[PDB]
From Swiss-Prot:
It comes from Staphylococcus aureus. This is Nuclease A. It comes from the Bacteria. Residues 116-132 have a biased composition (Basic and acidic residues). Residues 116-136 are annotated as: Disordered. Ca(2+) binds at D16, D35, T36.
Length: 136
């Protein structure tokens, strides 16, 4: 089973990336299973809804009383050294919240980190049915 662990917000970086203090070590976390429009995209830079996605993630984590990270069953860090996890703010998953608001798309996945793929898929479907942001 997966389990939530405490972490401390250091700095929100992008809609899909936040820096946290985890087990006394500062580290960058990439939100599992979601693709948000980027402000800091390597090529081209800022996309439509990039600033909106970043502000949403930032607002959600900064106003949170408790931040928790939930690693999945596969690899816990990507090739860039970023922790791969589901991030919770006062019990609500940031990953799902972004998708539900149509501020992120469920990323393509096939590796073992897919425990919440179905849950996210359902919220994404709802967001496109309601024609929210990205889905307009």
């Amino acid at each position: 089973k997966l389990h939530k662990e405490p972490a401390t917000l250091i700095k929100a970086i992008d809609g899909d990336t936040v820096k946290l203090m985890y087990k006394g070590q500062p580290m960058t976390f990439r939100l599992l299973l979601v693709d948000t429009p980027e402000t800091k995209h390597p090529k081209k830079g800022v996309e439509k809804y990039g600033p909106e996605a970043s502000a949403f993630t930032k607002k959600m984590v900064e106003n949170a009383k408790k931040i928790e990270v939930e690693f999945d069953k596969g690899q816990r860090t990507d090739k860039y050294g970023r922790g791969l996890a589901y991030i919770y703010a006062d019990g609500k998953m940031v990953n799902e919240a972004l998708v539900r608001q149509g501020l992120a798309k469920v990323a393509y996945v096939y590796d073992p980190n897919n425990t919440h793929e179905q849950h996210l898929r359902k919220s994404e479907a709802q967001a496109k049915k309601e024609k929210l942001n990205i889905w307009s």
